[PDB]
């Protein structure tokens, strides 16, 4: 039995070597172990205790020894969750926007927000992935959103959006151990490396750290290897686009390419983080559907939260187009709000999964 | 929000997980005090109980990675936290102790309860030995020695025995947590720094790294202001002074970093392989220990193996309690301790004491 705690403590003794001997494909197989132990803890037992303490050994050398942090572990690391979980079978630009979370910020569901507002501009397809409930709140049942039902869903919906928890079984199992732990692990960072769709071909990946970025683009490029990529670091340490100060861009384009974003550069007024705060989940999504879809604000209004959504989908187009024309984002993107265009997107969807 | 919790704990994790870490050895000392709080606390089977035994890992391994717990003033702070969780001896107003880290991956003789043992016979010499079985095995009850009864056996003993675990409550929290993460910790080099009776005057700290002997002289010298000692490396990769090859002295001299270098012919002995100086276990060990040496079975200048290596380990603790480096006048008191039976005497007369509890 390969699958033993013998097995991981062989490789926890390889971080602990001066210098470190685990390989990025040696990661790949203590996680395979890692979950395959996780499995087999549903009690409070000496076992339990016994197991929970050498994962909490191996990840924490993990991340003492910063290799969680490199490219090529990282994709390992993705590569072995997504071991555990339900893949899309499917038979034009076709985007992702999400962060790693781990910035402690509290701020608003931009990434759903804005996915959806691209989804209304003509030539963009959403394929939104992530969550742990916004789209959940607006009377659809999202357990029914699967493996098998994406395919159907495809071909008449310009915007979907897929909920990790029912796709990777994998971060189930380790889900109480990182709360436990209360430290950042691997695991904070595999999120956003986990699209279960392998069509989506354009994406912008909010990170927590500007130490980590540049190692996430690679990462990125290694696990999405058709993907033109936006990372994104807030200057005030945010994993998305900030409404205040600066925000640092790592351009992959199939040579790491980097630039810089601020609100005036979208003819936007800057907004502290206290004005676009997350109220959670049903709040989010009635503020969405309620002030923004529904047309009450505009460009000009200076209302925080609107400016905030739509800088994110300017970035958006602008990555989907190839170019850096923000102001003719913002254009599109008002547009798709206040065609109507943002909401019969988001309804075409809710409508979909309703019928299944 | 009280200090004594996982919150205080993660605190700390985090302050390891800095670049650089950002732990003090102050730091560590109350981390280990939540650890212990913590471990003492724990209701069986409780969601709460995985919770800390995540902690606790993370930080000892947190720790471990970092090696901030190998250095002299982390060491003094962590034997320092665990101590408060100990039964220390208290006696009324020479004394020497010998003892290694373990943790050099050699399943050698216990020649440190026996030359203890054989010491102990050389008159004006009292050796009050803390530790760990072999003891164990020659019939008297080890758990009836705790802080409460060593009072009693002091007076009239030239030799005694402490088995760690009897003392050392903290050690106890932290056993089944050790066994789990299968991996060295700070725990792994405590032991000799752990000795409950301060009247110890001098002691042999032996150590299973070169690289560990400097800091932990320093830390030896912080926990024990006191006394004289002898950190010792075997070249070989043995906490012990080796019957194969050279082995380092770091000498702390508190009168006066001395480090001078031993081998087997400067007592007039030949070398032996490690593989000639087993542990056979226990059981086993007492009796060799007993029919082989204590008995006067074997002599000076027949080369058994296991008597040479008892008897230079004596040797030196005797040149340290005299304050010399006459290894062969060190040899010939060890020589006299076995074949006149004082040797055995001061034995029986600790197990008969006990007994006697
Ligand atoms: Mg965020
Ligand atoms: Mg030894």
Redesign the pocket.
Known sequence: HHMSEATLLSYTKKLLASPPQLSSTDLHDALLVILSLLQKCDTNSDESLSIYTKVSSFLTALRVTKLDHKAEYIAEAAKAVLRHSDLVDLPPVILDIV?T?G?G?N?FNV?TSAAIVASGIQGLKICKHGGKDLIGTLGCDMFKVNSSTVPKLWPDNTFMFLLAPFFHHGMGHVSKIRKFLGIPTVFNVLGPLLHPVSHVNKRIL?VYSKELAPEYAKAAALVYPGSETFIVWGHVG???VSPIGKTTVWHIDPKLKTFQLEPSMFGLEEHELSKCASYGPKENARILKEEVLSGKYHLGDNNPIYDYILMNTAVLYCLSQGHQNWKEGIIKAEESIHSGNALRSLEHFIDSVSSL
């Open positions: 962060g979370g910035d910020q701020t990434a909010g945010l994993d998305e």
